[PDB]
Design a protein around this ligand. Structure first.
Ligand SMILES: *[C@@H]1O[C@H](CO)[C@@H](O[C@@H]2O[C@H](CO)[C@@H](O)[C@H](O)[C@H]2NC(C)=O)[C@H](O)[C@H]1NC(C)=O
Ligand SMILES: CC(=O)N[C@@H]1[C@@H](O)[C@H](O)[C@@H](CO)O[C@H]1O
Ligand SMILES: N[C@@H](CCC(=O)O)C(=O)O
Lengths: 238, 147, 150, 93, 79, 182, 43, 50
């Protein structure tokens, strides 16, 4: 009886007789009413702060190193003849061998293949990828993590070896950082639209992966109930 | 040409030259290998982030320059001990400096000279944002086992 | 080598009574490699001006060990006397202008290399040489934060 | 708080006339490629502790039960007093 | 509100017709009103088999009714 | 608002909860054989629909605790049903609404965004005069209109994407036509 | 009117999802009524 | 419904936006910020006239 009230008075019961018992039931009902209201309200709050998680941790993820022993094995590639291909070749021989059948020929082609599902991941330069992320139609394209760089380097100016212009050139470059023209130049050219600060737009349809816990609890309850029933029957037999 | 750093387009049909705030680059054209012609060049207009960096830098170390686009290769690759692209152009003394999205690495630093970097880059992975959220045990998040 | 005290990159701890560095392990049980430094103790040379041996370790210390093994050199390290990174100032009404801190240690012949979080800029680049960067960063602001309601 | 400004990184300082300056730069470039620099970040920088975020949806703890469970618990001690009054009233009237 | 009260009247009449094939008329509206605002009012159930299916469908309607009202009411307060 | 039944729950979820009520009802039938097959049909559904239909309580002690957990299952899914729905009503697409004259879509104009103004007016003088807006002036010069009634009409349909004009005139138009906004 | 949140009050549009189901259930029971009453005498 | 609003609505926060914040650009005696003496951070500020 008194366990029925806490779960929204779902089950039917039979009322008691004592007046003090009636008072106890009435004061338990308040507790149950407040208890459930608090539960729903918190539950709504958790969802409005749901945060997303990256599918792949990084370049050393399980799906990247051994893609075969996975379902519809993961598809990823890059455009060859560049620095990215050179680095993967010297550090991951088997991954580089696997990537050979997913080679792209352009950044726009790679983005188009990624949007239509023909590709699952794209590996390329960090500076151009962050630019394309913020200029996309909508905000469908993101970079793993909050923007992560592996084998950090930078863009430079190639000059003839043993020349005399290098000291002047890099002194002039450091001077632009001191004045602050770099910020103006990146605001003028490298500004973006989309924000990657965990937007977490919305869920939908409450798929089975969410109800797995409650279904497992129901199954465990059924199993323990049948085990206890069998034990009670055996004990009653003896 | 790289989309955010070096953008190239054709000259004004009205005047036949380059607009303001741009720089001229000459490009070379090669016809069919069966029969080819004397030097054929097309004038284009080049603008972007690296172009602005080249313009400020040029006015204070005081030098003049002319721009042209590479034809053989894109960035640089060592094939049979030979380099192509911008790196190969610089190696053959055909060009003095190369300006663009060129990454500094140990392999290229043994054949040319790099200046201090003006932007930081690297290797990133891009995926499409999967619609929905993650919630394996969200229903157990409220309250605690003690209560 | 001249080094400065900065916790994420350089740790400075007193030596044991024996005169060596105490053993310590990481989260995975591999030993932490330390080095014997020498520098001023207490606050500064302002009053107790005398150097004592100490132990050093961190991000920059084990990068120097990697460089030494590859480049095949042997090193001795010490701390900067005044505890400053280095700027250009003028002294006692003179036309000359001279560096202090860690920048002046290298220029005066008291050092050969600077292994510390030193920022590359135009002003320092006209007297010394800088290598390619081993860390890319910027400038930010550190503030305090409060507690929410109940 | 805020964005970054003045983006200069960390380098190794030597004199303009040194036999070591060319080899140091090549070793640093090589160390970034093979992942030795990423190993140092994990050991000394990115181990981390208490985490970020400001909204902080929070699981409700025991503090709510104090203002709620006390009434039902106080109802029990206040129920036996009404028990005697009710049963005695049947005998009294 | 009237677009659902008309359905209260329709379902009450349908259940009264079903009971023909101690269930009075007023008790029909009383029980049918009870489910809309949670089962807090004592009532008496109609033994009719198809009436049971009808009132089960009505309960399924009322559950969705109350839940949406709470979500929206909550929503105004946030914004 | 979409369909009420299908918006927060996939049709496969209804089947899984649709079949599990019979599994519980079948489970109670096993307790009857070891130690009422119509009465208990109702009980399992009644708990889900929190209605007072039926008066059949479980008999066995183990059967008592099976339905004891079954009551909790109904509370969980109903609470998640209301919770998810509210989240859906609050959260909206962040969208892009042209932050201002410094928006990157205007400073670097592609062919997918076209904006213009009225020919021979004081907006033309503003852009033509000052040299750091040359890229923007070139884009508008080939798309400018003759009067503002035409540019406002060309925004109601998708022939034009942005119109730059006086705030006093434009704020009146936004308060009389509902498609438009500033 | 203005505002960006624009909390949309629910209107009759939601009826088609739900109000038709109960309306359909009314006519779905009378079909079983004729079968049920016959099944009383059919066995 | 009110409990839900109270659990997700937070008081407004100042959260200085960076180097262009009005507090830093127009300083007063009630707000104090500083850096380390004789650092590169000092050279940066002392050399731009704005
Ligand atoms: C990467 O470089 C190779 C050369 O090693 C390119 O392959 C050549 O492509 C041209 C253009 O179609 C052909 O005419 C040659 O016959 C190809 N040679 C070989 C050996 O395949 C390749 O196209 C380049 N890929 C990218 C994306 O730049
Ligand atoms: C198969 C192949 O690439 N062969 C080339 C050869 O043609 C070239 O003359 C020389 C360059 O090193 O050797 C290699
Ligand atoms: N920026 C690269 C090209 C892009 C890449 O290959 O990752 C290079 O300089 O070669």
């Amino acid at each position: 009886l008194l366990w029925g009230l806490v779960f929204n008075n779902s089950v039917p019961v039979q009322n008691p007789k004592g007046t003090t018992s009636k008072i106890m039931v009435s004061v338990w009902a308040f507790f149950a009413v407040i208890f459930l209201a608090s539960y729903t309200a918190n539950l709504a709050a958790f969802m409005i702060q749901e945060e997303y998680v990256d599918q792949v941790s990084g370049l050393s993820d399980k799906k990247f190193q051994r893609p075969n022993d996975f379902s519809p094995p993961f598809r990823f590639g890059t455009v060859p003849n560049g620095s990215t291909e050179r680095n993967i070749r010297n550090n991951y021989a088997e991954m580089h061998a696997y990537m050979g059948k997913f080679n792209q020929r352009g950044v726009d082609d790679a983005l188009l293949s990624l949007k239509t599902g023909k590709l699952d991941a794209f590996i390329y330069d960090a500076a151009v990828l962050n630019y394309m992320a913020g200029r996309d139609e909508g905000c469908k394209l993101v970079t793993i993590g909050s923007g992560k760089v592996f084998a950090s380097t930078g863009y430079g100016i190639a000059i003839q070896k043993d020349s005399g212009w290098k000291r002047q050139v890099d002194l002039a470059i450091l001077q632009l950082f001191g004045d602050g023209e770099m910020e103006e130049l990146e605001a003028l050219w490298l500004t973006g639209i989309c924000h990657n600060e965990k937007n977490e737009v919305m869920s939908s349809q409450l798929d089975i992966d969410n109800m797995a816990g409650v279904f497992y609890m129901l199954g465990a309850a059924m199993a323990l109930s049948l085990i206890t029933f069998i034990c009670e029957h055996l004990f009653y037999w003896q | 040409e790289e989309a955010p750093f070096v953008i190239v387009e054709s000259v004004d049909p009205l005047s036949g030259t380059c607009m303001r705030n741009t720089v001229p680059c000459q490009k070379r054209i090669i016809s069919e290998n069966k029969t080819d012609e004397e030097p054929g060049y097309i004038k284009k207009c080049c603008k972007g982030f690296c172009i602005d960096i080249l313009k400020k830098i040029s006015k204070s170390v005081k030098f003049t320059y002319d721009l042209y686009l590479v034809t053989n290769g894109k960035h640089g690759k060592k094939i049979n001990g030979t380099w192509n692209g911008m790196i190969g152009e610089v190696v053959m003394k055909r060009a003095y400096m190369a300006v663009g999205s060129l990454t500094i690495n140990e392999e290229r630093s043994e054949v040319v000279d790099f200046s201090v970097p003006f932007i930081e880059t690297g290797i990133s992975v891009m995926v499409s944002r999967s619609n929905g959220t993650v919630s394996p045990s969200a229903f157990l998040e409220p309250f605690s086992a003690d209560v | 080598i001249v080094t400065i005290h900065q916790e994420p990159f350089v740790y400075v701890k007193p030596t044991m009574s024996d005169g060596t560095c105490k053993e310590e392990f990481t989260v995975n049980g591999d030993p932490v490699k330390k080095v014997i430094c020498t520098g001023p103790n207490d606050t500064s040379p302002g009053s107790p001006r005398h150097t004592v041996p100490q132990c050093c370790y961190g991000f920059c210390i084990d990068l120097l060990i990697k460089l030494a093994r590859t480049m095949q050199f042997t090193y001795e390290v010490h701390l900067v006397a005044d505890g400053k990174f280095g700027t250009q100032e003028r002294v006692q009404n003179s036309n000359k202008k001279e560096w202090n801190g860690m920048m002046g240690e290298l220029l005066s012949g008291q050092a050969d290399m600077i292994v510390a979080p030193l920022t590359i800029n135009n002003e320092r680049a006209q007297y010394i040489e800088f290598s390619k960067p081993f860390k890319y960063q910027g400038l930010t602001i550190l503030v305090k934060k409060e507690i929410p309601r109940s | 708080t805020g964005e970054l400004f003045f983006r200069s990184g960390f380098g190794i300082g030597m004199r303009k006339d040194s036999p070591w300056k060319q080899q140091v730069s090549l070793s640093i470039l090589k160390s970034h490629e093979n992942g030795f620099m990423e190993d140092l970040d994990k050991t000394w920088v990115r181990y981390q502790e208490c985490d970020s975020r400001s909204n902080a949806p929070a699981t409700l703890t025991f503090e709510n039960m104090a203002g709620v469970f006390m009434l039902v618990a106080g109802g029990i001690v206040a129920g036996i007093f009404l028990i005697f009054i009710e049963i005695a009233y049947k005998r009294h009237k | 509100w009237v677009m659902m009260f008309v359905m209260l009247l329709i379902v009450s009449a349908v259940a009264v017709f079903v009971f023909e094939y101690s269930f009075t008329i007023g008790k029909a509206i009383w029980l049918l009103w009870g489910l809309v605002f949670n089962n807090s009012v004592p009532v008496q159930n109609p033994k009719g088999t198809t009436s049971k299916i009808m009132v089960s469908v009505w309960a399924f309607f009322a559950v969705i009714f109350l839940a949406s009202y709470t979500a929206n009411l909550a929503a105004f307060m946030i914004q | 608002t979409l369909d009420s039944f299908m918006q927060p729950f996939q049709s496969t979820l209804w089947l899984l909860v649709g079949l599990s009520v019979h599994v519980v009802a079948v489970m109670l039938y096993l307790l009857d054989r070891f130690s009422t097959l119509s009465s208990a049909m109702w009980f399992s559904w009644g708990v889900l629909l929190n209605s007072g239909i039926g008066e059949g309580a479980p008999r066995s002690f183990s059967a008592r605790i099976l339905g004891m957990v079954w009551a909790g299952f109904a509370m969980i899914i109903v609470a998640s049903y209301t919770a998810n729905l509210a989240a859906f009503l609050v959260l909206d697409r962040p969208e892009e609404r042209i932050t201002g004259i410094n928006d990157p879509r205007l400073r670097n104009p592609s062919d997918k965004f076209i904006y213009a103004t009225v020919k021979q007016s004081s907006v033309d003088i503003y852009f033509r005069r000052q040299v750091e807006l040359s890229t923007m002036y070139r884009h508008m010069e080939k798309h400018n209109y003759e009067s503002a009634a035409e540019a406002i009409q060309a925004v109601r349909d998708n022939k034009l994407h942005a119109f730059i004009w006086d705030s006093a005139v434009l704020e009146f138009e936004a308060s009389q036509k509902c498609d438009l906004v500033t």
